[PDB]
Amino acid sequence: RAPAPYLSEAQRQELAAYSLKIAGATNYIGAGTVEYLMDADTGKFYFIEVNPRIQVEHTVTEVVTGIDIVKAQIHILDGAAIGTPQSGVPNQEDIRLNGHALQCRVTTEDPEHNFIPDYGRITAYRSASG
């Protein structure tokens, strides 16, 4: 889910500051994810690790921010500066949340058969959009 719906605006800015600290400290190039565990009892955050790559769940962030993370990666490696139009990335002050998103992966894991993936011929596939 993006953003995390149980966070206050304060917790949201707290986490963002920690992540910029980590990214700067490692002179990070490209897209990466800084992972925390939050103690639901206390509200405390604890850094766990950095995933130094794009992730399967990037899509929820693209939809609520409007920023294509893959084109951003390509422009960054072409030498573009974040905040210039040719980077595809706004300056921080122009990055905003717009709404909420969730994402799910649909698989052939059969819930009625202990999540063993099913296999074989798909006889019909019609997606739903809108």
Flag whether 49 is marked binding.
yes
One residue of 8, 27, 42, 98 binding its own copies per CB under 8 A: 98
Instruction: For the segment 35-64, give every residue that binds Mg ion (CB under 5 A).
Output: 35
Q: Residues 48, 41: contact at Cβ < 8 Å?
A: no
42 in contact with its own copies (CB under 8 A): no
Amino acid, res. 127: S
Q: Where are the beta strands (DSSP E) in 11-105?
A: 33-38, 45-51
1, 12, 53, 96: the catalytic one is 53
Residue 87 and residue 85: Cα distance in Å, rounded?
5
User: Is 12 designated active site?
Assistant: no
**Residue 117, binding choice from its own copies, Mg ion, none, Cβ under 5 to 8 Å by partner class:** none
User: Is 105 designated active site?
Assistant: no
Task: Pick the closer one to its own copies by CB: 44 or 71.
Answer: 71
Cis peptide before 3 (omega within 30 of 0): yes
One residue of 30, 52, 66, 83 binding its own copies per CB under 8 A: 66
Q: Residue 84 has what DSSP assignment?
A: S
Q: Which residues are catalytic?
A: 53, 57
